[PDB]
Design a protein around this ligand. Structure first.
Ligand SMILES: [K+]
Ligand SMILES: [K+]
Ligand SMILES: [K+]
Ligand SMILES: [K+]
Ligand SMILES: [K+]
Ligand SMILES: [Mg+2]
Ligand SMILES: [Mg+2]
Ligand SMILES: [Mg+2]
Ligand SMILES: [Mg+2]
Ligand SMILES: [Mg+2]
Ligand SMILES: [Mg+2]
Ligand SMILES: [Mg+2]
Ligand SMILES: [Mg+2]
Ligand SMILES: [Mg+2]
Ligand SMILES: [Mg+2]
Ligand SMILES: [Mg+2]
Ligand SMILES: [Mg+2]
Ligand SMILES: [Mg+2]
Ligand SMILES: [Mg+2]
Ligand SMILES: [Mg+2]
Ligand SMILES: [Mg+2]
Ligand SMILES: [Mg+2]
Ligand SMILES: [Mg+2]
Ligand SMILES: [Mg+2]
Ligand SMILES: [Mg+2]
Ligand SMILES: [Mg+2]
Ligand SMILES: [Mg+2]
Ligand SMILES: [Mg+2]
Ligand SMILES: [Mg+2]
Ligand SMILES: [Mg+2]
Ligand SMILES: [Mg+2]
Ligand SMILES: [Mg+2]
Ligand SMILES: [Mg+2]
Ligand SMILES: [Mg+2]
Ligand SMILES: [Mg+2]
Ligand SMILES: [Mg+2]
Ligand SMILES: [Mg+2]
Ligand SMILES: [Mg+2]
Ligand SMILES: [Mg+2]
Ligand SMILES: [Mg+2]
Ligand SMILES: [Mg+2]
Ligand SMILES: [Mg+2]
Ligand code: NA
Ligand code: NA
Ligand code: NA
Ligand SMILES: [Zn+2]
Lengths: 143, 93, 88
RNA sequence: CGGGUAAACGGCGGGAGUAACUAUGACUCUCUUAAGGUAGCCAAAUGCCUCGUCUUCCAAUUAGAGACGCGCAUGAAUGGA
RNA sequence: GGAAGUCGGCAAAAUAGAUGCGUAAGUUCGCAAGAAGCAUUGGCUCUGAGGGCAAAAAUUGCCAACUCAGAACUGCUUACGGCGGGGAAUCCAACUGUAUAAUUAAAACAUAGGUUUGU
RNA sequence: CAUGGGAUAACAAAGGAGCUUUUUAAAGGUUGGAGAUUAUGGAGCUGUGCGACAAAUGCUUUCCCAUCUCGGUGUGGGGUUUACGGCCUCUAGGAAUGAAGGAGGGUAGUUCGGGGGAGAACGUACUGGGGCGUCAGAGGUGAAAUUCUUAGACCGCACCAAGACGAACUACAGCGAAGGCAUUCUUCAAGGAUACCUUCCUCAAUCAAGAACCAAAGUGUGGAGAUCGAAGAUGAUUAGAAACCAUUGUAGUCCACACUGCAAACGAUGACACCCAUGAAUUGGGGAUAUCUUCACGUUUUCUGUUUUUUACGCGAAAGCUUUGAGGUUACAGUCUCAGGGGGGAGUACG
RNA sequence: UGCUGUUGCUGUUAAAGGGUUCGUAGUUGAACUGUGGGCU
RNA sequence: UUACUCUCGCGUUGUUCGGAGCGGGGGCUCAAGAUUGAAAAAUGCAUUGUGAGUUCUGCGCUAAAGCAAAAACCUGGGGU
């Protein structure tokens, strides 16, 4: 979004605290936190969205600091991880919508240029996931 | 779209059936919970399906794409004109 | 392997009728023998029978339009104009 | 009477002077038309003089080919290459 | 001996099937191309490959019709019929086609392509 | 070739839920030597019980099934602890470096902007055309002439047609990878910045080969043809003028699809990363705390990202550059890549 | 002859940054598992 | 009929087919043949098995060229 494929140089991001201990006023047991994570997944939420629900309305700043494990690790233990990784899923969805737009507007050359960048990003990402065996070999992206 | 998100939840968690003939069988029984029809449906076939839904008081949704789009939205590689979901699991609708 | 470099279907003409006239006829020749998408049903099964006459293998439906293609570009504009005027 | 139109029929120039050897004239005057043949091509199925001049082909070629061009009388849909 | 004949290679001679290898300039990339050119071919006695139907059946029996390839031996007097000679260039017409029944088949006509006129 | 050392590195593997020990008891399944036959036992194989000790993650667990003031401490005060029940199930399941002022993804203001595509309309102006009036000139230049005009030019008013183009506001301002991009409304897919105690965990930087885009002029096929205008025509000027000036005018200039791949395509300055003095501004987002209107604007101070300007070290042959380097270099080493080697012949010849 | 430059050249104007991006070989690539202790 | 889940399956010499319903089990129907008999031995003259050819038939039905019509007959919708 910033550096690869473009000239952006933005710095906006979050900064985790030095003190990794949950506050005293938080009185939720670790078992119940794990239950809420798995419940939201069956409802259809992605790991990024799950962590924001707990942050916004439950007082849980970091799931790892309460339970000892990350959100995606919890889903893998319960057999709830997505078939393909989340960031690869969103990039494929974006490219599909670009291609559907382009089949009517054949002269939108700016969109055609952006489609080249997104598909290069997909192929780089797929190569990494195949090396660490998060994707099957011979997985291929089809335009 | 919101309808496509729910179809994916049903496709992985619930139970469904594809095709006009099998959907009508579920409507003759009482197992159907929702019927989805593509906009590319023959007018006489659509009128017959809607009549069955009215008699059995089954909610019906008019999909915004054709039978090609409906099949793709279910993860299939073929065309489907009518879809009937007998079991909805972990989904609102 | 590939059997010709430049002229695919015009190879039946040998060396006769000139490069540019062959080239111009090739674009329309390819179009009139391809399978076009059918809005009714959902298949790529529209084939031209005679000039301006198209029949669907799946639908078994007959449509009138286009000498060498199913829909002319001028027809697409006219449909949008008529729909807009009706909605007024 | 006054306008338009050449992928309508058709048409598309002469004289003398001039550069540090000579030759030739980039240059300069002069008479003249509706316009004065542009790009190309040639002794060509179109050149009278003519068996033109040079090269190649042969022991020997009024024949063939490649060049040159003041072209009796080449030349652009009377279509040129 | 080999076009010296003749206006002019007219007429005649010449090439020749099939199979393997090989094939230039030029080009509208389709061709040119059977370009050019080299080699083999008989008879006889054998060997291998290519199938159908029934009961690690990766096994057993029965059976039909032809083709191709390889080897040994043994011959030629090069021996029915039928069957392209080839190459380097110039002029004209783009090409298939038409056409003076009874002296002219062409560079003539037509053609696709291009332009103009009337409505 | 042998061998000692382990700081800096390289190769390979993995992608983290494909992840107890011991002690007793019981049950079955070498005979003198050489050649045969058999049996008793070791050892190990399972399934029973037994004793003893651990465990890096609590089985006096979890889960739903239900049914009903004192004491110790520090200096008379401070701070520390203290002053519905029962039941039946189920039960590999908490032990994993951290989240780069490196990359990717998410959510939000339904954010920001002459960014891109599509469709409807709007605005004056140039040209032309009729409708209403008028009458002798109008146009053009340094001065004139080609040119138009009593068959009514030029000029005046309201209109009609068609094709281009969006003045003033417009700025050392914004958006875009570059080429480029200014009227309004509706519509489609994008892009960057900011905010975050969201997710992930090395996925990165730069490049032969290969691919996509690329002003104007030019090419092909369809449209269109108002304005301007290569070629050409006609007036002038001039010794001459094929030119500069004037009146015209073909191809073009505009649109769709397909080619071409060149520019003083320039900041004449390759990409990524670090450090670096000062003062006023400016565009977008956010945080903290006197002005106007009825939520917007604006004040003061911080902050991240953008295009710049003025007056430091240092550098340079100089002109000049300077947080935006051409600085941090003979005190010569962060990483990758492109090009040059006196002037011509020449970006020519051949392939 | 530091006018072939690994040591060790130049590329704003002297000769010389590719029109702009994507991208495969290739070259290059962030931190972390580690202070031994006691005696005269 | 979770048949196409993540290389889906059936089929031709051949240019393709399927949730608008593939493949498998069981059936209905059409076309062309085969077999059993009557005719027919009472006739004719004095035998039943494979390969090659052969347009009836089946494989359902180039083009800016897309392949005559009517009589006669057949079936149905209504009504009686
Ligand atoms: K990170
Ligand atoms: K007027
Ligand atoms: K008037
Ligand atoms: K602000
Ligand atoms: K600000
Ligand atoms: Mg001439
Ligand atoms: Mg001549
Ligand atoms: Mg001779
Ligand atoms: Mg000659
Ligand atoms: Mg002419
Ligand atoms: Mg002539
Ligand atoms: Mg001889
Ligand atoms: Mg003689
Ligand atoms: Mg002869
Ligand atoms: Mg060749
Ligand atoms: Mg031969
Ligand atoms: Mg030849
Ligand atoms: Mg001819
Ligand atoms: Mg013929
Ligand atoms: Mg002929
Ligand atoms: Mg005759
Ligand atoms: Mg002719
Ligand atoms: Mg022609
Ligand atoms: Mg005047
Ligand atoms: Mg404006
Ligand atoms: Mg242009
Ligand atoms: Mg054009
Ligand atoms: Mg044109
Ligand atoms: Mg003009
Ligand atoms: Mg002019
Ligand atoms: Mg003059
Ligand atoms: Mg510049
Ligand atoms: Mg440059
Ligand atoms: Mg901004
Ligand atoms: Mg400054
Ligand atoms: Mg150095
Ligand atoms: Mg030295
Ligand atoms: Mg030097
Ligand atoms: Mg220079
Ligand atoms: Mg540059
Ligand atoms: Mg390191
Ligand atoms: Mg299937
Ligand atoms: Na003609
Ligand atoms: Na006017
Ligand atoms: Na014009
Ligand atoms: Zn159809």
């Amino acid at each position: 979004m910033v550096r690869m494929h473009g000239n952006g140089r933005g710095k906006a991001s979050s900064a985790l605290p030095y003190r990794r201990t949950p506050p005293a006023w938080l009185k939720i047991a670790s078992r119940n936190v794990v239950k809420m994570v798995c419940k939201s997944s069956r409802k259809g939420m992605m790991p990024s969205q799950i962590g924001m629900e707990l942050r916004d309305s439950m007082g849980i700043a970091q799931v790892k600091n309460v339970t000892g494990r990350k959100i995606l690790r919890i889903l893998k233990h319960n057999g709830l991880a997505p078939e393909i990784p989340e960031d690869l899923y969103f990039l494929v969805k974006r490219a599909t919508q670009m291609r559907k737009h382009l089949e009517r507007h054949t002269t939108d050359r700016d969109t055609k240029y952006r489609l080249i960048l997104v598909e290069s990003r997909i192929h780089r990402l797929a190569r990494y996931y195949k090396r660490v065996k998060q994707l099957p070999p011979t997985w291929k992206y089809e335009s | 779209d919101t309808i496509n998100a729910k179809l994916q939840l049903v496709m992985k968690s619930g139970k469904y059936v594809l095709g006009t003939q099998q959907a009508l069988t579920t409507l003759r029984q009482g197992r159907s919970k929702l019927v989805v029809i593509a906009n590319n449906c023959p007018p006489i076939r659509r009128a017959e399906v809607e009549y069955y839904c009215t008699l059995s008081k089954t909610p019906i949704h008019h999909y915004s794409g054709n039978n090609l789009d409906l099949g793709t939205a279910c993860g299939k590689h073929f065309r489907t004109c009518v879809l009937s979901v007998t079991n909805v699991g972990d989904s609102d609708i | 392997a590939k059997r010709t470099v430049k002229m695919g279907v015009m190879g039946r003409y040998g060396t006769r009728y000139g490069a540019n006239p062959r080239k111009r006829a090739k674009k329309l020749e390819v179009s009139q023998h391809a399978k076009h998408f059918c809005s009714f049903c959902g298949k790529f099964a529209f084939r031209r029978k005679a000039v301006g006459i198209w029949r669907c293998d799946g639908c078994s439906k007959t449509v009138a339009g286009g000498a060498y293609t199913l829909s002319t570009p001028n027809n697409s504009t006219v449909r949008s104009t008529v729909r807009r005027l009706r909605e007024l």
